[PDB]
Amino acid sequence: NTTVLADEFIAHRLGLIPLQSMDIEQLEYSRDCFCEDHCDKCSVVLTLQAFGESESTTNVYSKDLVIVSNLMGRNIGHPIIQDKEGNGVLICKLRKGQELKLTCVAKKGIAKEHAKWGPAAAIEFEYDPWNKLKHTDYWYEQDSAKEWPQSKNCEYEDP
């Protein structure tokens, strides 16, 4: 790591990278696995190797993350790409001559142990948009109906 970012800074950024988990039930937790530290039945090994061979800034994305362990035919390990450009999350930047070589072991994890494992993002949850159950007392200055915007779900219930 000859970059400007701290080692654990980049490790933090890497931990927040979403990974494909379609067949995660086929994996095992490393804590209840029989291997010493990590094996193929409980982990996926990636390796990020980058070099600043360009005179301009070279952006180390998550698309350069390459899976090393043989996935045994599963559908795990791959970083999730969403944008049209095809480059993943901007993990780091490199000036000319800077080099960043590192390896990652990826276990299965839930959002309780760390939010980086959270596959949920924001979950909208609403009930009784018209306040017919009287579960809320609407704070108001002159009129609660006017000052409180009608939710989009108000169209799905009888006023």
């Binding site: 400007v4 701290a6 080692d7 939010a115 007392d137 609407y138 409180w148 915007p149």
Partner: protein, 1176 residues
């Protein structure tokens, strides 16, 4: 726009501010003062005196050698070079600041002076006057007299002309502003020291019991002279009920308070009418004459100048002058000690008599209830010594030391007739060590805290430190004159409240100019000379003061003030010069000396074309400034100096600010006279006589208070708390933190610029170097764990990178030469041949004694391995042999801290001995106990952390990053917190940036309407759902983004416990501090509380078993502790008493034993007896 000369709006003035900060910068005062010191004041110090003449008389026993010699050494011009460093090998090369910081060097440039050694000879013929002539040996030859430390970015610094690319090349942060020194690799800043101004007459009422009712004083001092303080005081003895009211003056070197009339007749003013005219200016002012009659009736005993001078000489405290020469001696007292600031020559007795009469006139006017006593806290009566004057007076003293040493050496070598050399004469160590000590330690001499370690915890902290002023010690009150010159609310909460101040954003400090051109201007423009000023023939005359020196009177002060203003506005007079016209007192005061604090203001003229008052700045100048800024971001350049040169802006200080009227905003106060109810109420003042205009009211705030969003929507103590708390905020202090080996650094992972941002915070580079994060805050009594300033930080938000930080700590270690060949060596100490090796593991060191970057270090682990040689061939302790010739001097890691070693730096010190700096980096993740605060004084610790599911959530699934208690809002009245949360919500939704400047026309109604347009409740409330059951909360929660700072006060650095550990060597008590595993204080009032609880045994256990229990022996005959005990041999014996069976042992604190021992050592016998010799 289309109209070139159209009036400007309130938004336009910001462009002006931009131009100002393009030329000045945030630390312009530091650099300006140091540039003045180097460019002109060093030469003034050198030239003044420093001409050592030694007149060796012939001492001719015979007329053969009747020749008298005179050896003189003169110092010519002084040459200051670019900073360079010496070396162990002697190679001298250019030194750069990001080499001095790393190598523990001093960014100092050598000084040289041209020494001219002249020698004169004369023929020693008795009676005939000696005539000295040269011997044609006019040898001249620069010599090195020391090194002057150079403040960074100054005109004599390598970074003065560096461009941004050059600064990046030199490992220098472009955001770094300079204006500080590097002493032994540490950044030292000189706090602006506040003092009372010189050459100003101040009159004070005294207490009733004291026989003096009023005291008029001047702290006279001349800048171009010896710079010695003589406090002339004029005191009015006798109370209002007293009938004998004699005014007495306190001349220096005089044992008694001489009556004023005696002084007046001594200076040469004998007749009573002339004295009274010199003191009183109105014949019809019979009240002042009646009060003054006691003085003349007292001095009627003397009717002659020689008589008065003889009277003073008789009272002269020297007591070494004959009767006939006392006159002459008195003359000296009245020529070189009485009011030095006027003149030091003779023939100006009339001028000093005039000044004495003026002082007495001021005293009488204050005593006759015609004027109020002078305010001591008036900021125009105070001067701030910056780096310039401080270094100037320090170097004056230090060079006086050096030249006295030169004279002593010359006298010694001429009396002993040895050879004379310049190198053997000058001792550059004198100046070098004096400057380096006075800058390394806060003590400014041979005051305290003048030089302080530059605060590098945050960029705003660094800026506020570089613009800090300290007042030595009702000075704590925020005075009215502090408006726009120091921050209204930025000062520590503790004992320094009010004494420590911070400059306003646009406030500058004058550097001082030569007042000769102004005197020439006054003389040309009709200033009546003070010598022939007869007040009877010119009663309605306005007195002109220049730097406090009454220089003359003028009969048409209006035209004089107008032309002086024009000359200052056209650049002929330096704009720092301040001119004041007090019409009621009919006085004109011109101040040009350094230390004065002024601020810039727009100029308003009559503007007959529009028929009403208008700013002299119009849209054309704004357009040119915009063009110049855009060109920087081809046309003729237009800078702030151009505005200053064409009379567009002005510099006004607190002295001139007394006689001006300022418009707060142009758009509402200049033009002559259905309104929005949400806008705050403002007044028109129903008056059109403005002289200047505030460039912007938000400029009254300091650097730290310019970060506060909506500070006018907050309680002032909350603004003060935030000002003192943003210096503790955590952010990016410099962009080159990776190449700086500072002692402590804390950096946010993801500093975010505020959603609610001010217009004054893009001159502070806050958006470039933010010191906080935008956290989604909900204000709710959610779980009861956020009560009493506790907070509930979202644990899932922490996990994703909120407020996570890096912490760097550097350990410095040198090898020191104990002797010629006793050099220390960095190495891995080996248990076979090393002594006092620490219990921490050395396994992490390789052969060179340093941990390579990457290796994790834990508590107590050795990171620096150092050993020093000792004398061998000693046997003790069981395992000490001649092989243990190395004693361990290692430096382990902190006991509590741990992390990854970031870097280690090896280099050579000034002596050339290798030394190292080990920087270790760790991660501070927020946890239960860390202190976080808004920009409004809402400090608080993390009560508890909930995951994302447990937090209340809106209908869109958003969960807050923070939950703060509602109860903090009503009591503390931090409405600006709520307003900025609402504004941040609107800004985040709409994508714009919240304009949270203090005094804008931004209303809560407008923000609420914009929020309603975005589909949310206008007042920021959101229907939230309980995270445990999902049921809607019966109350709607205030919700939105808000800017929070993580403060330096973490619980990991404050937890501290001690069951047992190291003790103090003197009192056998636990040591002090958590850095030493010390013990907590069981103070006096804790003992008192335990007494009130009635628990005596617990108190005894606290004071004896827990701290110090010492068993000491005494004898029943004499209660002293002089009992020799041999416990193994079982023999107790008190010598003298001749007893061995009358002994007792007692358990007393070792502190008590030491107290009794110090009592006996001080001839007091605290005899301790174990039985009652008396009944109760």
């Amino acid at each position: 726009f289309e109209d070139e000369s159209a009036p400007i709006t309130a938004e336009d003035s910001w462009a002006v501010i931009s131009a100002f900060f393009r030329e000045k910068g945030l630390v312009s005062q530091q650099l300006d003062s140091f540039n003045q010191f180097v460019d002109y004041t060093l030469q003034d110090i050198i030239c003044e005196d420093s001409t050592l003449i030694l007149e060796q008389l012939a001492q001719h026993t015979t007329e053969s050698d009747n020749i008298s010699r005179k050896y003189e050494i003169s110092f010519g011009k002084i040459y200051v070079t670019k900073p360079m460093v010496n070396e162990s090998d002697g190679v001298t090369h250019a030194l750069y600041p990001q080499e001095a910081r790393l190598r523990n060097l001093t960014y100092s440039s050598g000084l040289f002076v041209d020494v001219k050694k002249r020698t004169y000879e004369a023929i020693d013929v008795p009676g005939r006057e000696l005539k000295y002539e040269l011997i044609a040996e006019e040898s001249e030859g620069k010599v090195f007299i020391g090194r002057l430390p150079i403040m960074l970015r100054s005109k004599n610094c390598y970074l003065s002309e560096a461009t941004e690319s050059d600064l990046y090349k030199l490992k220098e942060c472009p955001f770094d502003m300079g204006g500080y020194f590097i002493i032994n690799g540490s950044e030292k800043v000189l706090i602006a020291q506040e003092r009372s101004a010189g050459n100003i007459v101040q009159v004070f009422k005294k207490a009733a019991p004291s026989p003096i009712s009023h005291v008029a004083e001047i702290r006279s001092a001349l800048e171009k002279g010896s710079r010695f303080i003589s406090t002339l005081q004029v005191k009015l003895y006798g109370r209002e009920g007293s009938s004998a009211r004699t005014i007495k003056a306190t001349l220096p070197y005089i044992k008694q308070d001489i009556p004023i009339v005696i002084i007046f007749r001594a200076l040469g003013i004998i007749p009573d009418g002339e004295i009274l005219e010199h003191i009183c200016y109105d014949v019809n002012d019979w009240q002042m004459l009646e009060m003054l009659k006691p003085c003349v009736e007292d001095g009627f005993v003397i009717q002659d100048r020689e008589t008065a001078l003889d009277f003073i000489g008789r009272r002269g405290t020297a007591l070494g002058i004959k009767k006939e020469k006392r006159i002459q001696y008195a003359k000296d007292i009245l020529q070189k000690e009485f009011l030095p600031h006027i003149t030091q020559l003779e023939g100006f007795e009339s001028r000093k008599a005039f000044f004495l009469g003026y002082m007495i006139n001021r005293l009488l006017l204050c005593a006759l209830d015609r004027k109020d006593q002078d305010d001591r806290d008036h900021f125009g009566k105070k001067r701030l010594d910056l780096a310039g004057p401080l270094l100037a007076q320090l170097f004056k003293t230090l060079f006086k030391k050096l030249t006295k040493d030169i004279f002593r050496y010359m006298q010694r070598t001429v009396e002993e007739a040895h050879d004379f050399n310049m190198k053997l004469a000058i001792n550059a160590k004198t100046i070098t060590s004096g400057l380096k000590y006075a800058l390394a330690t806060g003590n400014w001499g041979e005051r305290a805290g003048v030089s302080q370690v530059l605060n590098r915890y945050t960029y705003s902290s660094t800026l506020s430190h570089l613009r800090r002023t300290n007042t030595p010690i009702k000075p704590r009150q925020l005075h009215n004159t502090h408006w726009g010159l120091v921050c209204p609310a930025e000062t520590p909460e503790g004992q320094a409240c009010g004494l420590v101040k911070n400059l306003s954003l646009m406030s500058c400090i004058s550097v001082g100019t030569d007042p000769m051109p102004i005197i020439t201007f006054l003389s040309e423009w009709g200033m009546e000379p003070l010598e022939d000023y007869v007040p009877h023939q010119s009663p309605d005359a306005t007195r002109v003061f220049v730097n406090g020196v009454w220089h003359g009177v003028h009969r048409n002060p209006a035209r004089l003030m107008e032309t002086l203003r024009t000359l200052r506005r056209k650049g002929d007079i330096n704009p720092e010069v301040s001119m004041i016209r007090d019409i009621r007192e009919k006085e004109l005061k011109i101040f040009t000396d350094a230390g004065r604090v002024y601020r810039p203001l727009f100029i308003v003229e009559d503007d007959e074309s529009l028929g009403h008052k208008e700013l002299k700045v119009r849209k054309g100048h704004i357009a040119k400034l915009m063009a110049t800024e855009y060109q920087d971001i081809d046309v003729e350049e237009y800078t702030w100096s151009s505005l200053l040169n064409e009379g567009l802006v002005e510099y006004i200080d607190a002295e001139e600010e007394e006689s001006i009227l300022i418009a707060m905003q142009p758009e509402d106060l200049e033009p002559a006279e259905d309104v929005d109810p949400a806008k705050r109420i403002r007044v028109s003042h129903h008056a059109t006589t403005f002289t200047h205009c505030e460039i912007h009211p938000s400029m009254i705030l300091g650097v730290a208070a310019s970060i506060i969003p909506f500070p006018d929507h907050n309680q002032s103590p909350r603004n003060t708390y935030q000002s003192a708390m943003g210096k503790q905020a955590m952010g990016v202090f410099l962009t080159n933190y990776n190449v700086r080996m500072d002692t402590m650094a804390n950096i946010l992972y993801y500093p975010q610029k505020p959603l609610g941002t001010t217009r004054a915070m893009e001159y502070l580079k806050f958006r470039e170097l933010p010191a906080g994060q935008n956290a989604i805050v909900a204000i709710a009594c959610y779980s009861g764990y956020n009560q009493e300033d506790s907070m509930i930080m979202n644990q899932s938000s922490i996990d994703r990178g909120l407020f996570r930080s890096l912490f760097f700590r550097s350990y410095m270690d040198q090898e020191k030469k104990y002797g010629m060949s006793i050099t220390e060596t960095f190495e891995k100490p080996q248990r076979t041949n090393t002594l006092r090796m620490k219990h921490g593991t050395y396994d992490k060191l390789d052969d060179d004694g340093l941990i390579a970057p990457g290796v994790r270090v834990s508590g107590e682990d050795v990171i620096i391995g150092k050993t020093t040689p000792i004398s061998p061939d000693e046997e003790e302790l069981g395992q000490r042999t001649a092989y243990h010739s190395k004693r361990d001097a290692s430096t382990p890691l902190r006991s509590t801290e741990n992390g990854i070693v970031d870097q280690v730096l090896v280099t050579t010190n000034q002596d050339g001995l290798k030394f190292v700096k080990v920087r270790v980096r760790t991660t501070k993740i927020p946890q239960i106990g860390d202190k976080f605060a808004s920009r409004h004084g809402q400090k608080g610790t993390i009560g508890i952390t909930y995951r994302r599911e447990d937090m209340p959530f809106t209908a869109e699934g958003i969960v807050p990053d923070l939950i703060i208690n509602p109860h903090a809002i009503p009591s503390r009245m931090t409405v600006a917190h709520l307003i900025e949360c609402l504004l941040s919500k609107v800004a985040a939704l709409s994508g714009n940036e919240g304009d949270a400047s203090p005094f804008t026309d931004i209303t809560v109604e407008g923000i609420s309407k914009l929020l309603r347009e975005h589909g949310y409740q206008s007042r920021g409330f959101e229907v939230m759902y309980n995270g445990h059951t999902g049921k809607k909360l019966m109350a709607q929660i205030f919700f939105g983004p808000t800017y929070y700072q993580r403060l330096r006060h973490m619980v990991d650095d404050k937890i501290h416990a001690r069951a047992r550990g190291p003790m103090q060597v003197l009192t056998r008590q636990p040591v002090e501090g958590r850095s030493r595993d010390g013990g907590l204080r069981f103070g006096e009032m804790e003992r008192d509380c335990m007494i009130a609880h009635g628990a005596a045994s617990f108190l005894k256990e606290r004071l004896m078993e827990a701290s110090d229990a010492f068993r000491v022996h005494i004898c029943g005959i004499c209660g002293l502790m002089t009992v020799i005990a041999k416990l193994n041999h079982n023999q107790f014996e008190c010598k003298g008493c001749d007893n061995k069976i009358d002994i007792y042992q007692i358990h007393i604190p070792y502190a008590a034993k030491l107290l009794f021992q110090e009592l006996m050592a001080m001839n007091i016998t605290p005899r301790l007896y174990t039985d009652r010799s008396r009944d109760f």
